[PDB]
């Protein structure tokens, strides 16, 4: 498939049969992901959280009406050693979804 | 005719009476007696009656009355979010206010007309119960702000005595009240 | 409006009042669920809901629709208990435990075992 | 509206239906909230497993590029072809059809089944499981966001009725 | 006067007559005749006429009539939800009821007063039409219980026979009905 | 009410009555679908529903709106058939097979551009 | 209706009329922002709508809610200017440019 991430992980994705690349900036990522989703022969692309937290702000304009390429934030190279705050993410999600901060 | 408060008789009445005590069947359906709705009811005599209260009950009676009214108001303004997700899914402060609202409307508002002691209550007895609840709630707020969970709080032994203060006689109530206040003070130190 | 002053022990069988209230609540829930299951579909209902659905159906087919039969009061209470037996014990939160022990467990026998 | 007793009855019937529609929408939304919260737990669980699977693949790729040849890794990159058989099954979720991913993902029959690379040979295995965790996270979060959209939709409808109609 | 069904003459008539046939404007605008409002009409002569039907039409005529009445009532009940959520949000088990109600309406109730053969309709013809509509509906419900989608059921071309049956002459009808019944059966048993 | 006394064979044309009431049915359907769009939005519609919506619109804008021109009856029936041809041939359930066979299929661009 | 005759230069302070108009207009759109956020999400927001919701709340809580105190016209005008000063210029497109500088300084800190 496709992943916009650090080229050192990109080769590992190639080992998993997944073409990947990156250049470590939000603007260039958003630039070439336009082509990537126009040349979107796959159904999902991954992007680290540090490039830009929300790919919706980027591809929402070009993916209009189309649903196949699902886009999600994925752990980065800093998280390769530290980890992630999973529950904070889920909670700020349900906050905007069902209107309030819950399950506390 | 069908419970509509817009007919001419009701409108003509509500313009000249001084208080409206709104009985409601939905409360007696869930075993709440007397089934007075505390949301639709109102009165217009409180401000004029404040001096007698200060001089015959306690110098702070009006402020405790407003505080209880405010707790009930907040607990009511919170119910929709409790319906949406349930009680366990809420925060610690919202859980606390839900619990203290239940305690108010189940140990102070509710009154058993057939019990030979709870059939009547003085003003000083009611003032004592209100003061007990406000003190407990102040302690509990300090505690959950400090880091105790609401669960240690719900199982505190002082609850089955603050909720049993209705059925004590009018003579044994001053002693019960002072020792219950001391116990409320004590259980907090264990939270400190 | 006067029903409560004419039922109970000495007047009828003493489980009359609570059985009445319980039938009322169960039928109300059944009707609401019967409306919702048209836009949700039964497969997305919890289990107690399918219980209430089947209950409401059997209720209006065996309790209400009685034809020209002349039911006593005991036959009516029998049919009421045989219908309440569909819901799981413990759901009948209006009744007291004594009567539940005493009369629960019967199944629909008489209304189809007899005219 | 023409003022007649028949019109008054018709409008009253309309009011009754409006209220009995509001309460039905509310029950449906409650069911949706139950489903949504049932999903959020398994969603965060898949996120947990993905987090603990990313570390493994990351560490396997780490020493394989340094403590093995800094070039055998790029040779393995050029060696293995890409994967495209990611055809998705459209999936029903509460009156809507959403994509669900069934990437075929062949593993065994590809080129160079066994050979020389020392740490690369197994670091290529870790990114397989990394991709599986990715696809599970995606498959759960798409459904979660869909159910969320349905909830906000229904609440919009309830507000519309109860505040305008 | 004014289409108002509450004026004194109409009410004074309701309390005397035996049957009541209510015409509505919405159907008359649609040019769908006779335009008899089904929800507002009634008749008090059915139960007393059932022996005549059993002896002169068919032994189960009352039961077919009752099943058609129940289906119309159930579709009327579903229309309330169809109005607030739209007809595509229902489950297939209910879209089926909506569609069979539409069929009953426009293929059995409707009647052409200027057509040379649809003007007068014998009673065994009505029996046959009811019988085959009910047979189709039962088979379609069974087929939905086996995963068949509601869309290809609406494309079955035996619906043409069912919708055309009412234009067949009174002497040409029995053969038509006997063909149509087995064609209906084969519309589903043959697909398997 | 007297419409049936003076239409049909030996008069205007044999397909007058059936064209008229088929138009009534299709237009009623279009209006009801408008009432539905007002609640569930235009995107949620099916395909035949959109065909009925389009029929209602084109009907109002070409058959009703003539504005001071004098149309003979043949022009009127011609326009009516051009508008009916938008719907699938299998949906004209109030017209016979032969009238369909020998009038269906005209386009509106031909009557005028 | 008779307000335009009784206010302004020589009768009250000079800025009275334009201050009143700008105050009305600023409170107007705060309310409709609160109406739209009420149904759609407050995610679809802009930088000045925050200013306007904040203005609407501080308005209802300080300008309207005066309790039992008796306010002279000067201090009512001062409170109004304070409430306006928490909206940037260009948002105050209704008041003239001289006292938009003459009175704009003081902010709500004085209570």
Author numbering:
A (entry chain H): 1 to 104
B (entry chain B), E (entry chain A): 387 to 578
C (entry chain D): 360 to 474
D (entry chain G): 4 to 168
F (entry chain F): 360 to 472
G (entry chain E): 360 to 470
What does the paper say about this structure?
We obtained structures of three rotational states of V/A-ATPase without nucleotide; state1 at 3.1 Å, state 2 at 4.7 Å, and state 3 at 6.3 Å resolution, with the DF shaft positions differing by 120° in each case. We identified a cryoEM structure of the original state1 from 39,902 particles at 3.1 Å resolution and another substate from 24,101 particles at 3.1 Å resolution. In the ABclosed and ABsemi dimers, densities for the catalytic side chains are well resolved, but no density corresponding to nucleotide was observed. Hereafter we refer to the structure as the Vnucfree. The structure of Vnucfree is very similar to the previously reported ADP inhibited structure. In addition, the Vnucfree is also similar to the structures under the saturated-ATP condition determined in this study, with the positions of the catalytic side chains almost identical in both cases. The Vnucfree in the ground state is activated by the binding of ATP to the catalytic sites.
V/A-ATPase is a motor protein that shares a common rotary catalytic mechanism with FoF1 ATP synthase. When powered by ATP hydrolysis, the V1 domain rotates the central rotor against the A3B3 hexamer, composed of three catalytic AB dimers adopting different conformations (ABopen, ABsemi, and ABclosed).
